[PDB]
Symmetry: D2
Subunit: 256 residues, 4 copies
């Protein structure tokens, strides 16, 4: 049986490493992207060349706004992502909510606050919520005998949000909501055997900071984070649910 | 000097107790409300009868949506207008208590009812408090240092039990999680202005059963049992506390199924 | 109608401030001390001059070791502290586990060093508070309900910063973690007796300054709120509040009093 | 061939941890206190599958002095780590799994020896011994020339996912696990320069002891949201093995719950 993984923001960096890792374990991967069409398509080509029909790409703005084709809502866009997996392969075993906007929203210095609120909250929290809902709906609608044996949802949280990055309030708030989603979905979906966990990087694949990380005095590589994601999705982690695992080299143990 | 407190959702229950307690300590109180006009106005009459010009009421839907003029009005604007009402009337705003909150189910397992739920639950519990804190801070920043108050305090009403989620209340739980994040982020960012930001998280308070599950007293709490903690955090005796959430839950979060 | 408070390590700094604040609220205070007899006795004199028979002092090494009189165990010494309140005033309403040893135990005539550090650091910060709470609770349980006080409150002095460990203080950090557990465990088990158990965790308070000024100033400057360590009152007022009847629904919780220091990262 | 030292390795989780590390290629030093027969049988099985891949060492990890000047807990702990170096010339992984667990009620409704031994036993096995073991483990790595050091040092502390929602009447045990969490963070920070990772794994309900009426047993496991059952030993041990693998080399100072969502419940 070939399981299917939907990974949002899979075009590069961590999402790509997650997609690659899942692919190496035998998963067919649906690579979501927003603006990185070229990178998403190149990654799909590479995976499909290794194993035919093992990758596809889907475009979607995960910001909490309506888009043009009656306007299309974020929920619809989200359901369409999950549906794309079912239409193409007939299944969706894993969902990795990785796509994320990250930029300042200083409390102390228009409609710029409007798009920021919708973009930061949508990608990091509201979209994951709808995606999880669509994912669960498809599992519930599948007759028990036909269901997969290892449903796993991973939310990409942030090991450092409890020690907030100055000026990033909305982003920090959204990761906070993502943690809540992880616990609430883990509890509510347990009866369907759908595990919901979080993985929270500290500093990874930086585009100074490095020297502050206790372990190795550097930010992590993409694999150092993605291997943890892959492990949580494996059958060896079947009793883990509702938990967030930090992958930060001891950074959250530091103080100013 | 008579300090001013803005309390959202002040018409009844915890909010009213918070408004009353602050009032008893000498604060002039701006009582925010959404649909409880009668209650808000009655509370205002009581406080003003006790001490003239010590209370006012301001209406606002804190849901993350555009309303119609009384161009559409955004939640930010409505939030800035709440803080501005304090400055216009009394020339100051020392304390902000983000208490207003919608709470109802959003089950993952069973269309336009989803969009209003998202905007309502997230707006009242998280987005509105963000904009309110922003407006509050901007007013403080724009005040010349020599004229600023000596005890700025913002309290976010969180929830002691959200880490042990109520089945079927996902959006609400997520919003409180966001509110916790706002508490920490605002406490860090606003420290230079000496604006403290803390949280108070009830377990079971003034239930309209679960009661017997509370380790301490085997009952839900009274409004005062929660409001007194809020008032204390607002006091100069709590001036070194910031970015922390205090549970007022009688040990309920220490339980397991 | 005068309540009694037992405060360990009450001779100076935070403990003194806690004892003074409880005294100002009308409590009679049993001031525990280990090595600071002179300071403890002076504090007692002050309090008793303000209000006769409102203060006493008891000496006790709270390290997890047997002392000389069969040898006396820590538990016995602990029970003896609580008993001292009952013998003198017939009651014990509040217990503040404040006494605490704090020095390095780096991981990277010597057997005596590691052996006494473990007992001292763990005893003062965790084992003694455990036995003191046990003693305190037994006295409440053995009191007929009609005579019991209406506001029993135990406060454990934790540390807002132990989750971001101070390099080289492992045993101390371990003991404070044990103290957090004691707070939650005692809060749950003692709820039926209406004995509230809470923690107060300072960040940097009345910071010891045996170091260059730039270094000392470097440390306080890291605190987001005020860029300074706190005063003793800034911590003690929170303790006093948690002990008051207005905090009677709060139990099993640890309150940070750190000016946002725990929100920082390197 | 890397070496793992696993305390309380004779049965249950420790056995499974020892077996899993063994299946990954580790030589395993199986520590035990009272389960000699079980430890030796486990060693026999491992050595039969791969010669010289297992040894056993006995030690009371309670915070008391033993019979030889009396022997201290620290010495006993240093001796465990040393036994790995003496036999195989290395110690790459340490799993602090041994743990005593029994009630210490605050209220009652010979005597002194039980209180004194409970404190030392519960605290020693769950916290003080792990401390001394980590210290011994670290001293050995520091004394090894960088050129001879292993490339994946990993320490795992077996914590408890449910201690924050205390088991009524288990105060000392709960206190010791809290200390263990502290040790995990403190050691992770201090040993980071030597590339020694220190993490925790905290079970919820695992291979639940069933010395009670079946319905009471069904009742407890049914409180667990995922699967409505306690976990298998492998379900916990596989997570330990994963954290010890090179795939987890950027993870340190973190405690991972393996509780099927139990800590998410409320009464
Ligand atoms: N790297 C780190 O040090 C770090 C630290 C802590 C947490 N994290 C978390 O780990 C995850 C991955 O980190 P990363 O650094 O790889 O992320 P990233 O490079 O910052 O962004 C990942 C992808 O998110 C997508 N995205 C952004 N806004 C979107 C929107 N409005 N709608 C749909 N997609 C959107 C983008 O896709 P397109 O390019 O196609 O437009 C982007 O490529 C994120 O959730 C992040 O919060 C990362
Ligand atoms: N009581 C508890 O057991 C409990 C437990 C945990 C946490 N809390 C938290 O403590 C706080 C107070 O609790 P409570 O029980 O007193 O609250 P509540 O009775 O449920 O509601 C408080 C007020 O919030 C206002 N509100 C709701 N939706 C709004 C919106 N869309 N826009 C503007 N205002 C809105 C309402 O004002 P109007 O009536 O004027 O329309 C309502 O009166 C809340 O934040 C709650 O989350 C309470
Ligand atoms: N100050 C801070 O920045 C800070 C930060 C975090 C937490 N805290 C916590 O707050 C509490 C009070 O802080 P502090 O700075 O005021 O404490 P402190 O000055 O360091 O010491 C408090 C007292 O504890 C007593 N003590 C130490 N070891 C003892 C033992 N073996 N047996 C009996 N008594 C012992 C000593 O009494 P004698 O002098 O009579 O011998 C000492 O005066 C402590 O629990 C501390 O851990 C303080
Ligand atoms: N099973 C669970 O549901 C559960 C839940 C939460 C956490 N945990 C943690 O996971 C770990 C393993 O759990 P488990 O249930 O497998 O443990 P266990 O069966 O209860 O005991 C493991 C071993 O610890 C050793 N031990 C006890 N006291 C000792 C002492 N004084 N000195 C030296 N060794 C001592 C014993 O070895 P000998 O038999 O040779 O004497 C015992 O077999 C423990 O740390 C436990 O706290 C388990
Ligand atoms: C620089 C920053 O602190 C850190 O490396 C993280 C924070 N969270 C992130 N989140 C997103 N979406 N993208 C990033 O690059 C990061 N970087
Ligand atoms: C009913 C629930 O158990 C609990 O009593 C709290 C949770 N959060 C709440 N939040 C709001 N806004 N209103 C409420 O009545 C409650 N009730
Ligand atoms: C020095 C350190 O950073 C911090 O201020 C605290 C930690 N805990 C303490 N605990 C005790 N007993 N005494 C102290 O002075 C302190 N100092
Ligand atoms: C019985 C309890 O609920 C839980 O399953 C755990 C707690 N910690 C434990 N610790 C040890 N050492 N052994 C055990 O069997 C357990 N069981």
């Amino acid at each position: 049986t070939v399981p299917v993984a939907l990974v949002t923001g899979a075009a590069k960096r961590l999402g790509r490493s997650i997609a690659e890792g899942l692919h190496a374990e035998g998963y067919a991967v649906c690579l979501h992207y927003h603006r990185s069409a070229a990178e998403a398509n190149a990654l799909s080509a590479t995976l499909n060349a290794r194993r035919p029909n093992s990758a596809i790409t889907v475009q979607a703005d995960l910001s909490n706004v309506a888009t043009a084709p009656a306007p299309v809502t974020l929920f619809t866009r989200c359901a369409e992502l999950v549906a794309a997996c079912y239409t193409h392969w007939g299944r969706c075993d894993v969902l990795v909510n990785n796509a994320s906007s990250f930029y300042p929203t200083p409390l102390l210095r228009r409609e710029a606050m409007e798009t920021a609120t919708a973009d930061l909250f949508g990608s990091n929290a509201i979209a994951p919520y709808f995606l999880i809902k669509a994912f669960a709906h498809r599992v519930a609608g599948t007759p028990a005998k036909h269901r997969g044996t290892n449903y796993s949802i991973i939310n990409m949280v942030d090991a450092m949000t409890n020690q907030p990055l100055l000026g990033y309030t909305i982003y920090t708030m959204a990761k906070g909501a993502l943690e809540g989603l992880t616990r609430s979905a883990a509890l509510e979906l347990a009866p369907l055997q759908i595990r919901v966990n979080g993985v929270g990087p500290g500093l990874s694949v930086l585009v100074g900071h490095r020297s502050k990380v206790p372990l190795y005095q550097r930010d992590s590589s993409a694999a150092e984070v993605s291997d943890v994601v892959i492990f949580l999705c494996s059958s060896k982690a079947k009793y883990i649910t509702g938990t967030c695992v930090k992958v930060d080299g001891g950074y959250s143990l530091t103080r100013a």
